[PDB]
Amino acid sequence: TATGDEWWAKCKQVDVLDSEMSYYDSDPGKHKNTVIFLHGNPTSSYLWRNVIPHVEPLARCLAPDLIGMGKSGKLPNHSYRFVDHYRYLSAWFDSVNLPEKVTIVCHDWGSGLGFHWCNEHRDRVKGIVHMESVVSPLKGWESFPETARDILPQALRSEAGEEMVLKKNFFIERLLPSSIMRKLSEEEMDAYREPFVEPGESRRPTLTWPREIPIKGDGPEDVIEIVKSYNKWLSTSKDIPKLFINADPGFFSNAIKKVTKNWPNQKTVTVKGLHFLQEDSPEEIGEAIADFLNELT
């Protein structure tokens, strides 16, 4: 199912600041119940292709490609830091005729952006669904999941990051399949490869993202402070219904379950998967989001 071109034929484009962003939108401009799906690294809105159909009968579903990723525009200055993504994503939020409140569904760096957007736009949030998410700064390279303890310091956050990612597409060719339980069809793999076909700066988003991970003591301090701030808000957010979709065995999920154990007003459902759990349990994730929306209403 689902070529890259079939998925992106369903998506529209919108000008955003000095560039353009691609996004899925099941109901352009409608102010009915609305859900926004945010992917992370190194994926795109394609990641949600099998989840969204379970939610669409209840809600307008939007799923943007983050700037520099999917079919969204590439930036000539190739500056793809968290604050740069948040600039373009915030403008996108203001450009797609959203209703007064929305539910955010987010994954990985999509949750970093989504949690931050929510923290800055608190009266626009009717619920948050998060999975394999960025819920806290990390204490050190020790609190990272075991399969990546060495991958993140050495290599990507090093001088060697450029050659592994920009030249040999390490995040797409190695990391992505390494945290999916099944093996992707080459159709699905080509859909993930398409935004980063050309070697060089086109792949810079997949290298800047691991360099943004908030490691206390290392940095970056600006992301560390963004994450601490929205963690503080989330941990006392009694009025914001939350659904944590726990991946078993997961990647970040074990650590997230601990960070969020006492978060008020958070329900947990568990599904099978590693980090990219949408590729192993999209049906269960979609039906859990559908249940969550019905509880909100």
Residue numbers in the entry: 11 to 307
Anything the authors wrote about it?
The light-producing reaction catalysed by the Renilla-type luciferase is one of the most widely used biochemical reactions in molecular and cell biology research. Here we track the role of dynamics in evolution, starting from the evolvable and thermostable ancestral protein AncHLD-RLuc which catalyses both dehalogenase and luciferase reactions. The regions encompassing the L9-α4 fragment and L14 loop are important structural elements that line the main access tunnels connecting the buried active site to the surrounding solvent. We conclude that the LUC activity benefits from conformational dynamics of the protein’s rigid scaffold to allow binding of a bulky substrate.
These mutations markedly improved substrate binding, linked to changes in dynamics of the cap domain, but not the putative catalytic pentad. The asymmetric unit of the crystal lattice of AncINS contains two monomers (chains A and B). Chain A has a structure similar to the AncHLD-RLuc template but features a π-helix bulge in the α4 helix where the L162 insertion and F163P substitution occurred. In AncINS chain B, the α4 helix is markedly distorted towards the α5 helix. In AncINS, the inserted L162 occupies the same position as the bulky F162 in AncHLD-RLuc, making the active site cavity of AncINS bigger than that of AncHLD-RLuc. The F163P substitution in AncINS disrupts the α4 helix because proline acts as a helix breaker, introducing a kink into the polypeptide backbone. By contrast, we detected conformational flexibility of AncINS, accompanied by 1000-fold faster binding, based on determined k+1 and k-1.
